[PDB]
């Protein structure tokens, strides 16, 4: 298609602004992670269905993050944004998308970085704003495909009902 670029394997990369990167994880856990080194330090992660409440590892920045997480859906799959603002502070959980298609999407744009929230086939965007966001490198642990702006209701499609 020439609509979307890829795929690209899981890599560290610095994306170019008003770029949808659209996720294809498999398993559970971190899909992708990205920091500005000041005061923002973003990830997102993956429940697969029908997880109680727990606690989870997950290896955010090379570091083992205890998370308390759950997801009550039988069939639908649970990214969650985490996101802390100080070095030596703690993840809080932001803008969960429940996803039956398993796909996710993060965009630099306007001084922010924007995910897809809500549940499919209605999900929406919501953005978390971040300084000096052009330095943000982001290493993606999944397969992924570039999709611009422009073509950001093409992207939405693909998060609500899959390529
Ligand atoms: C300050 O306000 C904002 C932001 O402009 O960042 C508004 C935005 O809607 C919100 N997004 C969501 O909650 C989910 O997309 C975001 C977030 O709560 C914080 O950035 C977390 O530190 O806060
Ligand atoms: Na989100």
Not at 21 to 34: K, M, N, S
Not at 81 to 95: A, F, I, M, R
Not at 112 to 128: D, E, F, L, S, V
Request: glycine letters at 6%.
């Amino acid at each position: 298609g020439s609509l979307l670029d890829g795929p690209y394997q899981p890599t560290t990369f610095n994306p170019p602004t008003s770029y949808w990167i659209l996720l294809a994880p498999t398993v559970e856990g971190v899909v992708i992670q990205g920091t500005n080194n000041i005061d923002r330090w973003l990830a997102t992660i993956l429940i697969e269905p029908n997880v109680q409440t727990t606690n989870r590892i997950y290896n955010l920045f090379g570091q083992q993050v205890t998370l308390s997480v759950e997801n009550t859906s039988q069939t639908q799959w649970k990214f969650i944004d985490v996101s802390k603002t100080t070095p030596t502070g703690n993840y809080t959980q932001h803008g969960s998308l429940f996803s039956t298609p398993k796909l996710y999407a993060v965009m630099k744009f306007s001084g922010r970085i924007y995910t897809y929230n809500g549940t499919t086939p209605n999900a929406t965007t919501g953005y978390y704003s971040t300084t000096n966001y052009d330095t943000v490198n982001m290493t993606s642990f999944c397969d992924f495909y570039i999709i611009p702006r422009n073509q950001e209701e093409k992207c939405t499609e693909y998060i609500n009902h899959g390529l």
